[PDB]
Paper text:
The highest affinity ligand, the 4-(p-bromophenyl)phthalazinone-galactal 10, in complex with galectin-8N was studied with X-ray crystallography to elucidate the binding pose and interactions and rationalize the structure–activity relationship. The complex was obtained by soaking 2 mM inhibitor 10 into crystals of the galectin-8N-lactose complex. The inhibitor 10 has been modeled with similar conformation and partial occupancy (0.5 in chain A and 0.7 in chain B) in both sites to best fit the electron density maps. The crystal complex reveals that the binding mode of p-bromophenyl derivative 10 corresponds to that predicted for the 4-phenyl analogue 2 by MD simulations.36 The d-galactal moiety is localized in the galactose binding region, and the 4-hydroxyl group establishes a concerted hydrogen-bonding network with Arg45, His65, and Arg69, while the 6-hydroxyl group binds to Asn79 and Glu89. The hydrophobic α-side of the d-galactal is stacking to the surface of Trp86. The electron density detected in the sub-pocket reveals the position of the p-bromophenyl substituent. In this pocket, it is in range to engage in a cation−π stacking with Arg59 and a π–π T-stacking with Tyr141. The bromide atom is placed close-fitting near Met56, Tyr141, and the backbone of the flexible S3–S4 loop. The heterocyclic ring of the phthalazinone is positioned in a suitable range and direction to engage in cation−π stacking with Arg45. A slightly weaker electron density around the phthalazinone carbons suggests some motility of this part of the molecule.
Author numbering: 8 to 155
The structure:
Amino acid sequence: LQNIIYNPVIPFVGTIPDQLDPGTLIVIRGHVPSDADRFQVDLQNGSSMKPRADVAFHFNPRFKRAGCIVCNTLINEKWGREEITYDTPFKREKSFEIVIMVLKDKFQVAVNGKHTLLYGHRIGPEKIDTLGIYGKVNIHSIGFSFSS
Ligand SMILES: O=c1c2ccccc2c(-c2ccc(Br)cc2)nn1CO[C@@H]1C=CO[C@H](CO)[C@@H]1O
Ligand SMILES: [Cl-]
């Protein structure tokens, strides 16, 4: 595991230094502030703002009501079909560790050691070169364990 950054200012946008081949792990440690409505981790094809970079995997915990996680893909500035997970491990004022495991056909995400969700690839993961973190969240570290 090689961290590309510790204690980043949010929003954070950084280049991923190698390809997300099957078997790659992405590890993100952080904490949800007590007033958060949402945050997201986006695996992107570049960092353009105008027009907005494609988002292969948008991982979006939301804290209203019972809480949920929304996952989606942005292609050519259009969102696709939301996949919503209602069994969410995130909570306001609680710390987490996210592990994203890149498989051949999907991502598999676990939080605090416990399986959270799966998300099938809609953009080839080879096209991902950038990681962004947005919203109301405190991040301790972002790192990669590359299968290369
Ligand atoms: O709600 C936000 C948001 C909130 C705080 C900070 C950033 C954002 C951003 C945002 C915009 C550009 C860039 Br670059 C990075 C983040 N988008 N949305 C909007 O998020 C969407 C709203 C509804 O559903 C979509 C998923 O289906 C998505 O969550
Ligand atoms: Cl697979």
